[PDB]
Write a protein that binds this ligand. Structure first.
Ligand SMILES: [Cl-]
Ligand SMILES: [Cl-]
Ligand SMILES: [Cl-]
Length: 163
């Protein structure tokens, strides 16, 4: 475990993280994809061997000894708000199980279903609150990665509000 488990947020490419493992915002088919998924494919392509997994699940594949946790959030273009909310919560619950099983002291994590799976909505708060619900009982240092300057400020505010 981390000596004083924390949350932090950085605005940068998750492929350059300083943590002991990474969460990919994966598609269910293990394809290179776009956005976070394509950056993860360029950095850790070996981790996409048999990485296909259903919506609401996470599947870990090692790139050398570095764990890539492929977490499949729902595409809100296809899911109802209700069913999508359930699957997005479930994906983060499976990430917490994997992070615990791996015994890492730190994890780099993107906000699932906030990009091309958002069905054109702002889901910062929805996705971040499901991240917290899952990860609060873990003792890993969690570092959240984002690319937008206003999202960095809002994520940082939400972290500091609880402290
Ligand atoms: Cl960067
Ligand atoms: Cl997405
Ligand atoms: Cl972002």
């Amino acid at each position: 475990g981390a000596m004083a488990p924390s949350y932090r947020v950085k605005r940068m490419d998750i492929a350059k993280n300083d943590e002991e493992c990474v969460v990919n915002a994966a598609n269910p088919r293990g394809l290179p994809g776009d956005g976070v998924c394509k950056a993860v494919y360029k950095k850790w392509p070996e981790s996409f061997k048999n990485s296909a997994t259903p919506v609401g699940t996470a599947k870990t594949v090692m790139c050398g000894t570095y764990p890539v946790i492929h977490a499949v959030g729902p595409n809100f273009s296809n899911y109802t708000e209700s069913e999508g909310d359930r699957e997005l919560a479930a994906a983060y619950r499976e990430v917490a199980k994997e992070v615990t099983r791996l015994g890492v002291n730190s994890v780099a994590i993107p906000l699932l279903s906030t990009g091309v799976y958002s069905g054109g909505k702002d889901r910062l708060t929805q996705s971040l609150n499901h991240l917290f619900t899952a990860m609060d009982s873990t003792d890993a240092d969690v570092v959240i990665y984002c690319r937008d300057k206003e999202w960095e400020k809002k994520i940082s505010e939400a972290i500091q509000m609880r402290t």
